[PDB]
Ligand binder design. Structure first.
Ligand SMILES: NC(=O)c1cccnc1
Length: 340
């Protein structure tokens, strides 16, 4: 590739490794913030809108319950998530501003992106036009080029993890399954509709699983539904491994061709995992109109800007029962989370 790209990625890796080897720790505390609203909830954690009491800045605070993390066998994953987030720097990755822990919980305080999740916008408008899908896809391609060059696999690409910012660009969040991997890794993780065949079949897999997931995402953005859909996970998995996908007639020929090469069941033949790497994707005819540098520099006018009233507006997120952030009088799971 152009020496310009090589030197860019070399500097990117240098800067990542310095932070990776000496991670930041304990850079704020809970009582520096006011709680505003619950933005999302899961089996071992939540994301909250908070406001810093001295600066007035809004942030999204991800709170993980240490005991539930242990019970659900997510210790290494949560340590991965924070160590990676504090070390990365790319225009389409959410920014970690602070992290800390207390007797009960782990906390990651990130920039608040008021525009909401791509999932909501996609379901609201039905499907994205190919130019609109391509604008988002280009950002993911560049983000994976960045991550993979750092030996990072992302492992959770799906519309809910892609926030739309004030300029209409993507911010990838939720690094809960991201991992630094040289070669192969083995954990069953991800979301059913987005899993590559080699994950389903319990193989040692590599960064090619992210390129498979990009194929799923592009299909879902352009069609309005994912390519492998069913009521039970096992039925989804049967479709994924089958090597068969049906395309809507409205898809362009170029889109179908790209998707056949991303949704390639044989990982040794899948775009993004060949000798030419990401350039097989970047040079594909479906991306012929994409100015890769302009996308990186955020100089392309976005397909749409989310509607929101200001940095504290929560209208693009939905409503959840507001539960306590309780902190035990006794330290829980201290040993397991020493490095956090
Ligand atoms: N960084 C995040 O996870 C996030 C989530 C929701 C809104 N803004 C930011």
């Amino acid at each position: 590739e152009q020496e310009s790209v090589k030197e860019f990625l070399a500097k990117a890796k240098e800067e990542f490794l310095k932070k990776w080897e000496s991670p930041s720790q304990n850079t704020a505390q809970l009582d520096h913030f006011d709680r505003i609203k619950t933005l999302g909830t899961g089996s071992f954690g939540r994301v909250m809108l908070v406001k810093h009491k001295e600066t007035g800045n809004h942030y999204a605070m991800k709170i993980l319950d240490k005991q539930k993390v242990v019970k659900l066998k997510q210790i290494e994953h949560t340590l991965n998530e924070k160590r990676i987030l504090q070390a990365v720097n790319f225009p389409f990755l959410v920014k970690l501003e602070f992290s800390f822990k207390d007797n009960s919980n782990l906390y990651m305080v990130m920039e608040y992106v008021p525009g909401g999740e791509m999932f909501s916008h996609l379901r609201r408008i039905g499907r994205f036009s190919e130019p609109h899908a391509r604008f988002y896809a280009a950002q993911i391609v560049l983000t994976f080029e960045y991550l993979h060059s750092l030996d990072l696999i992302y492992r959770d690409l799906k519309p809910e993890n892609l926030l739309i910012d004030q300029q209409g660009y993507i911010q990838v969040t939720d690094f809960g399954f991201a991992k630094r991997v040289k070669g192969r890794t083995w954990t069953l993780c991800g979301t059913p509709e987005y899993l590559a065949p080699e994950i389903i079949l319990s193989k040692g897999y590599n960064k090619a699983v992210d390129w498979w997931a990009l194929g799923v995402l592009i299909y879902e953005m352009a069609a309005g539904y994912p390519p492998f859909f069913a009521d039970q996970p096992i039925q989804i998995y049967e479709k994924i491994v089958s090597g068969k996908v049906r395309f809507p007639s409205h898809f362009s020929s170029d889109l179908k061709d790209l998707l056949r090469n991303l949704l390639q069941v044989d990982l040794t033949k899948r775009f993004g995992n060949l000798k030419n790497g990401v350039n097989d994707i970047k040079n594909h005819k479906w991306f012929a109109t994409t100015d890769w540098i302009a996308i990186y520099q955020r100089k392309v006018e976005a397909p749409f800007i989310p509607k929101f009233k200001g940095p504290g507006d929560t209208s693009n997120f939905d409503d959840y029962e507001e539960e306590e952030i309780r902190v035990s009088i006794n330290e829980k799971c201290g040993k397991e989370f020493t490095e956090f």
